[PDB]
Symmetry: D2
Subunit: 447 residues, 4 copies
């Protein structure tokens, strides 16, 4: 009765989006009640009509929430009575809000997961398709942000795509456990009217039904799981954001964002701020915060139902909206991205080829340890001569090792360098292309 | 290098346990090298023998770790050099610490996850089994920690078993993705020797091979998923600890812990401290802490490899060491716990039957709200007459609603109340029985 | 796409409450600009008046938010221009959204903290008052949720009050660092007009001025601190809620919540669900989540300004709104709960006095180890005799130890038990009153 | 699985570093007992001498830890009996582990905090010192990691030092709440022997004593506060690492790390990996994870003592070790890094002066909007002419606006640019000198 207490319980402010799933759940329940004999065929007909009118009021946006509406379920419950009179009270028989709440969220989630899945797969398709087209671009690979060796721009794009593919895989698993109907669990012990849950299932299109009533109304695993999946996904995008922010600095000059996804200044148009990327990177923390909150909420709570559980809606609503938006922005960034081949090519230094020189020898039967030393020597010689490793003459190389035949010239070529990695997941064109194929088959399975 | 930075880079302190898996990676790799013409049969033979001898030393606990051994991979390399000499230097041809580390971890985790599931299933079995034996026991069902309605003890044990089975499903799922061979990805661009990754897979027993070299070297999703799974599991166990702790208070008296999993007082013979349950409950934060740190370690890191990743080992070893012990202790507690059917039944109050009184009129065709008002008048009446509702005379009842007949007597029985919930997932004995079977099959499919 | 990023970049939906502080910043800035000779006295007067008008609009609730308004700062600029013409543009001279946004949050937070401080002090005051009035109530002291020894209810209430007092102390520390003027830092290099920051500090009533432009613009320590403070505060409240919920069970029966702070049933008049306490408890996770998200948002961010920083607003707004409500509900729960001195005293058992029996011997000159065994023998003997410790006759006591005398009867008195704890901080009445005074001395300093 | 639980309680594996502080608390308690009449002068001197012996055994590393020792407190108790005989048992009179534990950590932390403080102050001193020396170096300031405007290198160093001084400020506050004596609280109701807590306070060197026994036993605020301080400190360091990791890229080339704090390549001499900076950045998550764990462990725990509290030791030990190391490495890096003034100046672009161009007109009396637009035109004219704005002829400027005079030439100077920021906190030399003086005074107050 305390005014502040009423306020703290008012979910009506944010749960209004659960309106349709509420109605969708009420209709199914009304149909099962008819089967239980609780409702006469005519009462059901009248109820389903009332319910269907409520949906229209919601769709049109002409539904009026009264001061007495603490939550969505109530709002729609009130409207039903206001419409079909007192027969609406029968609809309540046997069920509980504890039962409705989880059915509402799962139902909302199934719908939400589908939209998110579509956008995720589209992000992947965008990454693989751009990889295919730009398969000839070669740039430096980084370890500790220091240039290590050449790689194809496509191997870089594919590494992100491959990680995102595991996200779709996890999403599929999460969606499986969310597709379990909890309705018909009552307030704690089950539905007292021996209702037909199978009917409810088929009506709401769930894949199966909850095994235990106590568990069904008190567990929020499906929320934690969705939250974890969302968090790892965001970690993946934060890593992609970091890369593209760094690659788009004047210093690197590897690429440029579209004006639609960046901010500039009339005073110095050259300065293109990566707003899009910074927004995506920040959402990682926001989503993480939601995962951390629900985990702390659930810790140490006894069985069975407790009010603490009401924290779930705001968490899933916020993460669902964040992902739906974030994903679309990411797809936009990647697709309208402007790559600079010249700058990427210019970053490639002959010094990065010292290892390839050692590989050349290793292949000519020279044991690793020995081949590594020969390269170092060549690096030092080139240094003392005032030139670069690729500038060393056959004679200079011979001085170091007689194994250095004239064909060593081919080593000093960045494309030939990249083409050494032909093993399954390397940078050679063959491997890259194989990856594009594998990923395309994955998307077909919808993983 | 700075003395402190060197100490911070050293992992030899805790990674020693990865010795066997290092050797296993080295053996398989040595074989692939020979196949790639990098090693001769005689060189392969000598090396494999050396590797076997190092294993021997670890097993006998006679391996000596010198002060300069930065980590386990290093320790074994030095020892191989000390054993077979210079040809040992050929083993690292084309191999990088970057793809060695992930291979070691995934390998160790594969083995750990098998042991952990063994314990998880033993826990689930235990719960399902006891539930079967004590299916006739009834106790209060709680909502907001207040007695709500009669519930079967078994329906309570099963709510936990059902939650724990979902964990099993998730454990199976993380293992699927941990079972992917990352070896042969080189430092980041792949292996430059056209090495047979497929052969490495077969040797090491992984189910598949990584699609992208950069991803395989930098991703730590497998660590995240495992910690995420572990955290949810702990959330389930801390809830279970909360219940059993409250149920073991002198105020509840529902059960007692065996002396093996508690602590008492000589001065106070009946005071039994539930240490086991509190230790289990406290581990939830410990495990969650590891998840949080790794997500933070990963957030914002750029491609490809970074030293930051080193934080994965300690987080993983800790969680595996925690779950193994906690699951075992949880099993012991559940199995040796003694319940008091007396205190459980004695806790069942007539007030709890008020709802059934309403269910009764509903069955007599009485509209829900009408049936609800009547039970309210009934309880209030009994109140104004200083008596329990079950002691209201038939005439009193009829004075409230004509539909109250002699059969309303059956209503005032806890077993009869419990039986109302025959619907799928309810507390009726038939429903509990079905659940026990369904779970037995679930467990049966553990291979 | 662009429109998606556009909405994702908009904050007007929530930051409208920063309206007044924005107006306040602008007014101070205008005054300093005039002093710097950027504005004419006439121009100043026009701008100030215009700012007052806009302030009125928001106050009356008639401010029209044009769709072009991406945030509050832009909204007010639009309006000012619409009210006084082109001269309003001069107000932007040398200013940036970078130093505007931090001044806005600090000003809002500095205000909000005053309100939270008030509510916090009221909670403590309430706990201390009830502790004084109910200083004679005695109940069991718990350890591992098992009865340990009798304590005074006031000792229980004061343990929560002292903890809350440290939160109150941390609050002042936090408030101290929020009171630092960041305005006049520009985009990052400072303010280029040699503006008078001292004048700005005076106008806005800040305690000091920010030391470094880059830090003032990019630091969010004041947010992390506030959130860290808020989380610990909630941990304490969650512990308090945990106690009251357990104590209000029908099993414990120590107390009952007010009607305004609980939910009952018409069919079950004695079922009082502690809704208020469960809400308070759940707000811990919700507040913690905000801490964790901001900590992650800042982790690894390069200098200086980054769009990631905008996630701060919603974080503090939520936490500020949560604390304000929860503190008010906690105070009401305490002020209006009814305790059961009857039930509390019933819970005290003779067995709890076994330890005092040993103390009695210790004070007689008996070595600790020996006095302990004697009490155990006294306990066992009682057991075998089917009676309680207090029932043992002097004959039985003397056979155990000659040090037992007639005065041993005094031991078996709960009040006499408690009164042993006169050493500072203990449960003796003299200690409880000393605490009451000390906590009141403290609160006088917190104002 | 009893042995499993037993191992779970064996803190002896890590708590050994608490030997001295345990010895210290004991000696203070022994003296207090003697004063209270529990010990005779002779028993007292025997116990004190015995305690000294144990101290030495620990100092000499000769103390034999028998496998029956659960923790350090027990091990020491055992040893005293093995030295002084049954007189040792007198020390237990009225003391509790609950009481010892908190006192042990508080003493350990107090000492550890002094060490952390000095290292923190050293880092701050090094940053402030390098800023004084290198006050003439200028480089670009970044917003969105895009060149914004020229700032002095010293402004960048000071921005980090200032954030670090706040951390120092927080450490002192934490320190104050840790410096409160919890000993004398007993198991939960206080000490029954009327022990002199003031004596204990004096002996143990605490500033004050706990106000309430139940709080002193159950609270862990001092642990969470330390962890929060640690996390923010690490957040500041992770950011500093990020800056220096990027600034040391080949692409930026602003600075080079010492050989002692990096790792290079034999084949690539000019490649130096920022290992130190990556290890530092990675600890932020490690420390954060400990904070999150403890918070999760404390959430919802009932009064008073629970085994869950046992998770604090490892958390504190890990963070104290980590911080101590990280702080020394950070100081090393800053003190020995090589700066490239040439590459820094080379980063300065004429375009960055466009905004100063507008500022120039504002000082002439041209309103902000007009000035910003005129500058924009000059930027566009230059662009269309294929030249930089600093090469725009006076005639050209006069065609954009007659307000441009010959003195506009002074705008095109990066030192003149930096020098406009004379307002407090700005980048002008005078403003940077003032920060140094302000920092110096602060360092005097907190050491």
């Amino acid at each position: 009765t305390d005014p502040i207490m009423e306020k703290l319980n008012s979910s009506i402010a944010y749960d209004q989006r659960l309106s349709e799933v509420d109605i969708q759940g009420s209709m199914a329940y009304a149909k099962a009640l008819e089967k239980a004999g609780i409702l006469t065929k005519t009462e059901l007909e009248k109820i389903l009509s009332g319910l269907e009118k409520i949906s229209e009021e919601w769709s049109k946006g002409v539904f009026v929430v009264k001061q007495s509406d603490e939550d969505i379920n109530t709002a729609n419950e009130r409207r039903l009575k206001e419409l079909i009179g007192d027969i609406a009270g029968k609809l309540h028989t046997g069920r509980s809000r504890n039962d409705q709440v989880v059915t509402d969220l799962k139902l909302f989630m199934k719908n939400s997961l589908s939209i998110i899945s579509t956008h995720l797969l589209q992000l992947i398709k965008t990454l693989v398709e751009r990889a295919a087209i730009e398969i000839d671009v070669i740039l430096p690979g980084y370890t500790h942000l220091q240039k290590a060796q050449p790689i194809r721009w496509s191997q870089f794009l594919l590494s992100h795509a491959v990680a995102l593919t595991r996200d779709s895989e996890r999403l599929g698993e999460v969606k499986k456990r969310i597709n379990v109907l909890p309705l018909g669990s009552g307030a704690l012990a089950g539905n007292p009217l021996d209702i037909d849950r199978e009917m409810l299932r088929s009506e709401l299109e769930f894949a199966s039904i909850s095994l235990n009533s106590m568990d069904a109304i008190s567990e929020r695993d499906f929320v934690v799981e969705f939250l974890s999946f969302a968090t790892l996904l965001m970690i993946h995008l934060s890593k992609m954001a970091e890369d593209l922010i760094i690659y788009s600095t004047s210093e690197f000059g590897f690429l440029t964002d579209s004006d639609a996804f960046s901010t500039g200044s009339s005073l110095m148009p050259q300065k293109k701020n990566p707003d899009s990327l910074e927004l995506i990177r920040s959402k990682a923390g926001r989503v993480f915060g939601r995962l951390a909150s629900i985990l702390m909420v659930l810790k140490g709570l006894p069985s069975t139902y407790n009010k603490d559980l009401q924290e779930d809606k705001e968490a899933v609503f916020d993460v669902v909206d964040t992902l739906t938006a974030v994903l679309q922005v990411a797809t936009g960034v990647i697709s309208t991205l402007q790559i600079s081949k010249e700058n990427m090519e210019k970053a490639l230094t002959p010094e990065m080829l010292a290892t390839d020189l050692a590989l050349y020898l290793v292949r000519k039967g020279v044991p690793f340890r020995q081949a590594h030393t020969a390269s170092g020597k060549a690096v030092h010689l080139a240094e003392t001569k005032g030139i670069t490793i690729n500038k060393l003459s056959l004679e200079d190389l011979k001085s170091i090792s007689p194994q250095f035949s004239s064909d060593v010239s081919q080593v000093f070529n960045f494309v030939n360098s990249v083409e050494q990695y032909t093993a399954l997941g390397g940078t050679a064109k063959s491997s890259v292309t194989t990856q594009i194929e594998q990923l395309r088959e994955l998307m077909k399975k919808q993983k």
